[model samples]
Target: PPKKPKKPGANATPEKLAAYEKELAAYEKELAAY
Candidate 1:
């Protein structure tokens, strides 16, 4: 079983989203580098 995804607010900030994406990418890169 799975739950539906929640939607973000229309006014979400680009900087916040960018920071999350950057962190995720960095984590993946670190895993691959190991």
Candidate 2:
């Protein structure tokens, strides 16, 4: 099993979760482009 079961979006709405995912995607893009 994984360490923690709680997710960043555990109690979030689509708007909130999408914002969080967008931040993560920013990191992914930075890592890819930079």
**What tens digits encode model 2's per-residue C-alpha lDDT throughout 1-34?**
1122234645788877787677667766776776
Give TM per candidate. Answer: 0.51, 0.50
Q: What lDDT score belongs to each candidate, Candidate 1 first? A: 0.60, 0.61
Q: What is the C-alpha RMSD of each candidate to the true structure, in Å?
A: 6.9, 6.9
Show model 1 residue runs off by greater than 4 Å: 1-12
Clashing pairs in 1: none
Candidate 1 structure quality by residue, lDDT tens digits, 1-34: 2222333467868876676577667666776776
Best by the TM-score measure: 1
